[PDB]
């Protein structure tokens, strides 16, 4: 009865796994070099590009960006003579899509591709700041915590729609109103019919992220305008702030690096059989016996580069730092006090100085988890200031541990942000 | 009761005013040039430099600074170096030959009040093992190492916590008393029983320990919810005062008070011009100044916005860089505009053992505006605020980092 879920999900993991393995052997990579998180992001980026096929549903590709329409690739890092060297592979999109498909027993693994996409998205969320893009749109920097999903493609709507946060939605809509406001043709014409229906869908997606009946119906008013302008702009900004106090309903799926799935199947793990869920202990324990490395930079804190990957693996960048901590097993500080610069490596980076380290990716527990303006305001005035944890070994919900939180500690991951700005 | 304090301060304003007028003449600037903010800061800094005399109590060959005089359609960066005694002598003269201890500390807090709305210190907080969120407890954080009991009056909970922590962390007879003293000040900043206590116990620890690093850090955090009582002092540029007296206004006799409408009315009718780099928003540069004048950086933006009459945005939205100029900024990309230093309404300053369980327990659990025309506080407007608007001047702070 409950067999189907483990399988469709475990069978999804399996394929991501098989695919990674083949990909590594194909690339003549060593265990360490395969468990290198930087090589893993580069291999995932590669499968989505072929399935993307220039439609921005699976990839975040630029519009003017210079990359061969029928051939994807990325940087690979292998340790030779002790020094880390930067290699640059390039594969035929076919190789990727044929190898991917074969990894999945002839199926197009669309869940898998969405799983990897959401994982890159979670990482980005825990790594890059958005305030500079917020201000330019007319939004506020505090709206940074309504940003989950902002560096995701506007395609793969349901998935995007589930993981994206109010701000990401407000931000999207806010832009159309501009390009519509600015271009005269924008809402009239075949593009109005094509975009108007888009604009709308977006409103509904946003709308279905709100809880209070006032927010919901206010979005409706905003979507009923046939010529969105300054007025609808202030309303979305308004909704955007209401989200700060009356939190929305945003999905959060714990996706892990392919190398972590690829590493388990190759050790003998049979997922589709045992089964998988992203809800319970599966991603916690799979993370538990984790052995994921990372090129680390001169003067970076290995402990910190790890918090980052930890944080993205469990979808906790927008998580009250006191909640996360109780579960991590160690304080989970604000980005501002971190000392890494990202788990990527720039072309410009001097690899002569490059280091290598073992991410600490486990945890101490696992856990389960006009008139209107006025109605909303008050709902905010009256607003008031958690999840159930279980020891790893308590497979089932036999005994919920109580949380002993510390309420005097930093809760926000964004106050005093030090991260880079996500140009792309 | 009232009359003396209001006079004695009044005489201080008058002193600065005069001192500024005079120096204005030795430096021989035109009315416009004499109303330029950078010129007021540069003469203001001289006065303090001289009287300080390398002890780090006021301002951190001779004393000098940049003098901006516009001829004949570009501005020039004049760098004058004046005698340190010629300047302080001139200060005595404008003050009847009296040390304006109050007068000097007044211009000082003004600069502190400026730096406060202009520079971010989150970076120093973190280097000291503090919270960024503690950024709104940094009043007077940019005050001199040797700052008296008037300035320390203008110091925030986090400024004292920082100062204290930076000392235990530093090595690991009079440092003791000193470090006991700071603890006393911090103490006079809390409003509750338990908050005071921990401080006592803190200055009380026989030898500095990690318990305080934590205990101070913990108290610094309580002040964020259990607001304390840090003294704010509305201090205006010297130009503003100088000008006023040139008007003939006679502060010593009319009486002045920073606790009231005075600082406001003097600014309402006060005309200051500032240099403005290119692509900067004169209105934001004005916000910056207005804020510093009323000593309102750590104030809730909604209350500030109400009083001002116009939105007072977060420093992360401010299209400015600062009120000073470096020796590397082209003067042929410079020009000036008027600093809008007015307000819609004027307000009252609202003149003001497990300790962690009392504290935490507490934690979990009328500044009225009046028309500028209502001098006597005869009618109180109940500010109608909107909590949709932003309250923290600091979230997203992109401001330059001050370096202590």
PDB file of C-alpha atoms in Angstrom, chain B residues 29-137:
ATOM      1  CA  UNK B  29      34.457  82.256   3.723  1.00  0.00           C
ATOM      2  CA  UNK B  30      31.450  83.592   2.006  1.00  0.00           C
ATOM      3  CA  UNK B  31      28.174  83.175   3.426  1.00  0.00           C
ATOM      4  CA  UNK B  32      27.545  80.154   1.187  1.00  0.00           C
ATOM      5  CA  UNK B  33      30.924  78.603   1.926  1.00  0.00           C
ATOM      6  CA  UNK B  34      30.297  79.299   5.590  1.00  0.00           C
ATOM      7  CA  UNK B  35      27.072  77.310   5.333  1.00  0.00           C
ATOM      8  CA  UNK B  36      28.728  74.332   3.713  1.00  0.00           C
ATOM      9  CA  UNK B  37      28.645  71.183   5.987  1.00  0.00           C
ATOM     10  CA  UNK B  38      32.203  70.084   5.083  1.00  0.00           C
ATOM     11  CA  UNK B  39      33.426  73.496   6.076  1.00  0.00           C
ATOM     12  CA  UNK B  40      31.582  73.254   9.429  1.00  0.00           C
ATOM     13  CA  UNK B  41      33.060  69.788  10.063  1.00  0.00           C
ATOM     14  CA  UNK B  42      36.568  70.900   9.196  1.00  0.00           C
ATOM     15  CA  UNK B  43      36.654  73.909  11.539  1.00  0.00           C
ATOM     16  CA  UNK B  44      34.738  71.886  14.139  1.00  0.00           C
ATOM     17  CA  UNK B  45      37.405  69.244  14.004  1.00  0.00           C
ATOM     18  CA  UNK B  46      40.150  71.817  14.368  1.00  0.00           C
ATOM     19  CA  UNK B  47      38.721  73.223  17.685  1.00  0.00           C
ATOM     20  CA  UNK B  48      38.625  69.651  19.132  1.00  0.00           C
ATOM     21  CA  UNK B  49      42.019  68.717  17.754  1.00  0.00           C
ATOM     22  CA  UNK B  50      43.654  71.658  19.560  1.00  0.00           C
ATOM     23  CA  UNK B  51      41.976  71.177  22.933  1.00  0.00           C
ATOM     24  CA  UNK B  52      42.475  67.428  22.838  1.00  0.00           C
ATOM     25  CA  UNK B  53      46.298  67.592  22.497  1.00  0.00           C
ATOM     26  CA  UNK B  54      46.924  63.760  21.778  1.00  0.00           C
ATOM     27  CA  UNK B  55      45.009  62.229  24.689  1.00  0.00           C
ATOM     28  CA  UNK B  56      42.128  60.868  22.587  1.00  0.00           C
ATOM     29  CA  UNK B  57      39.430  62.636  24.647  1.00  0.00           C
ATOM     30  CA  UNK B  58      37.693  64.800  21.988  1.00  0.00           C
ATOM     31  CA  UNK B  59      38.813  64.061  18.391  1.00  0.00           C
ATOM     32  CA  UNK B  60      40.414  60.794  17.202  1.00  0.00           C
ATOM     33  CA  UNK B  61      52.933  70.567  12.660  1.00  0.00           C
ATOM     34  CA  UNK B  62      49.551  72.102  13.557  1.00  0.00           C
ATOM     35  CA  UNK B  63      45.885  71.513  13.279  1.00  0.00           C
ATOM     36  CA  UNK B  64      44.441  71.789   9.799  1.00  0.00           C
ATOM     37  CA  UNK B  65      41.693  70.475   7.546  1.00  0.00           C
ATOM     38  CA  UNK B  66      40.021  71.171   4.120  1.00  0.00           C
ATOM     39  CA  UNK B  67      38.445  74.480   3.384  1.00  0.00           C
ATOM     40  CA  UNK B  68      36.019  74.617   0.435  1.00  0.00           C
ATOM     41  CA  UNK B  69      35.616  77.893  -1.303  1.00  0.00           C
ATOM     42  CA  UNK B  70      33.833  78.176  -4.625  1.00  0.00           C
ATOM     43  CA  UNK B  71      35.599  80.218  -7.210  1.00  0.00           C
ATOM     44  CA  UNK B  72      34.476  80.724  -9.864  1.00  0.00           C
ATOM     45  CA  UNK B  73      32.369  77.753 -10.879  1.00  0.00           C
ATOM     46  CA  UNK B  74      34.280  74.814  -9.569  1.00  0.00           C
ATOM     47  CA  UNK B  75      35.059  74.188  -5.905  1.00  0.00           C
ATOM     48  CA  UNK B  76      38.580  74.042  -4.544  1.00  0.00           C
ATOM     49  CA  UNK B  77      39.975  71.804  -1.854  1.00  0.00           C
ATOM     50  CA  UNK B  78      41.963  74.287   0.239  1.00  0.00           C
ATOM     51  CA  UNK B  79      44.147  72.599   2.875  1.00  0.00           C
ATOM     52  CA  UNK B  80      44.915  74.913   5.577  1.00  0.00           C
ATOM     53  CA  UNK B  81      46.917  74.161   8.535  1.00  0.00           C
ATOM     54  CA  UNK B  82      46.380  76.556  11.349  1.00  0.00           C
ATOM     55  CA  UNK B  83      48.293  77.038  14.643  1.00  0.00           C
ATOM     56  CA  UNK B  84      46.887  74.793  17.403  1.00  0.00           C
ATOM     57  CA  UNK B  85      46.931  77.815  19.949  1.00  0.00           C
ATOM     58  CA  UNK B  86      45.684  80.386  17.447  1.00  0.00           C
ATOM     59  CA  UNK B  87      42.680  78.158  17.062  1.00  0.00           C
ATOM     60  CA  UNK B  88      42.090  77.347  20.706  1.00  0.00           C
ATOM     61  CA  UNK B  89      42.812  80.999  21.577  1.00  0.00           C
ATOM     62  CA  UNK B  90      40.075  81.960  19.130  1.00  0.00           C
ATOM     63  CA  UNK B  91      37.849  79.444  20.944  1.00  0.00           C
ATOM     64  CA  UNK B  92      38.534  81.046  24.305  1.00  0.00           C
ATOM     65  CA  UNK B  93      37.725  84.449  22.855  1.00  0.00           C
ATOM     66  CA  UNK B  94      34.335  83.320  21.586  1.00  0.00           C
ATOM     67  CA  UNK B  95      33.660  81.905  25.046  1.00  0.00           C
ATOM     68  CA  UNK B  96      34.582  84.805  27.341  1.00  0.00           C
ATOM     69  CA  UNK B  97      37.826  82.946  28.131  1.00  0.00           C
ATOM     70  CA  UNK B  98      36.063  79.850  29.578  1.00  0.00           C
ATOM     71  CA  UNK B  99      36.807  76.190  28.738  1.00  0.00           C
ATOM     72  CA  UNK B 100      33.668  75.040  26.932  1.00  0.00           C
ATOM     73  CA  UNK B 101      34.015  71.499  28.225  1.00  0.00           C
ATOM     74  CA  UNK B 102      30.308  71.206  27.446  1.00  0.00           C
ATOM     75  CA  UNK B 103      30.732  73.155  24.260  1.00  0.00           C
ATOM     76  CA  UNK B 104      33.537  70.890  23.038  1.00  0.00           C
ATOM     77  CA  UNK B 105      31.790  67.659  23.976  1.00  0.00           C
ATOM     78  CA  UNK B 106      28.710  69.030  22.165  1.00  0.00           C
ATOM     79  CA  UNK B 107      30.485  69.239  18.798  1.00  0.00           C
ATOM     80  CA  UNK B 108      32.029  65.883  19.617  1.00  0.00           C
ATOM     81  CA  UNK B 109      28.694  64.070  20.134  1.00  0.00           C
ATOM     82  CA  UNK B 110      27.578  65.739  16.930  1.00  0.00           C
ATOM     83  CA  UNK B 111      30.379  63.926  15.024  1.00  0.00           C
ATOM     84  CA  UNK B 112      29.564  60.719  16.884  1.00  0.00           C
ATOM     85  CA  UNK B 113      25.948  61.237  15.951  1.00  0.00           C
ATOM     86  CA  UNK B 114      27.067  61.654  12.357  1.00  0.00           C
ATOM     87  CA  UNK B 115      29.333  58.638  12.142  1.00  0.00           C
ATOM     88  CA  UNK B 116      26.465  56.699  13.750  1.00  0.00           C
ATOM     89  CA  UNK B 117      24.100  57.253  10.856  1.00  0.00           C
ATOM     90  CA  UNK B 118      26.836  56.918   8.290  1.00  0.00           C
ATOM     91  CA  UNK B 119      29.026  53.941   9.121  1.00  0.00           C
ATOM     92  CA  UNK B 120      28.369  50.227   9.718  1.00  0.00           C
ATOM     93  CA  UNK B 121      30.191  48.348  12.480  1.00  0.00           C
ATOM     94  CA  UNK B 122      28.781  44.870  12.049  1.00  0.00           C
ATOM     95  CA  UNK B 123      32.259  43.779  10.978  1.00  0.00           C
ATOM     96  CA  UNK B 124      33.781  44.844  14.305  1.00  0.00           C
ATOM     97  CA  UNK B 125      30.908  43.191  16.217  1.00  0.00           C
ATOM     98  CA  UNK B 126      31.720  39.823  14.606  1.00  0.00           C
ATOM     99  CA  UNK B 127      35.463  40.221  15.145  1.00  0.00           C
ATOM    100  CA  UNK B 128      34.611  40.770  18.819  1.00  0.00           C
ATOM    101  CA  UNK B 129      32.351  37.734  18.954  1.00  0.00           C
ATOM    102  CA  UNK B 130      29.208  39.793  19.076  1.00  0.00           C
ATOM    103  CA  UNK B 131      25.914  39.751  17.237  1.00  0.00           C
ATOM    104  CA  UNK B 132      25.255  41.721  14.090  1.00  0.00           C
ATOM    105  CA  UNK B 133      21.748  42.173  15.275  1.00  0.00           C
ATOM    106  CA  UNK B 134      23.460  44.056  18.087  1.00  0.00           C
ATOM    107  CA  UNK B 135      24.048  46.832  15.576  1.00  0.00           C
ATOM    108  CA  UNK B 136      21.227  48.966  17.011  1.00  0.00           C
ATOM    109  CA  UNK B 137      22.907  49.171  20.392  1.00  0.00           C
TER     110      UNK B 137
END
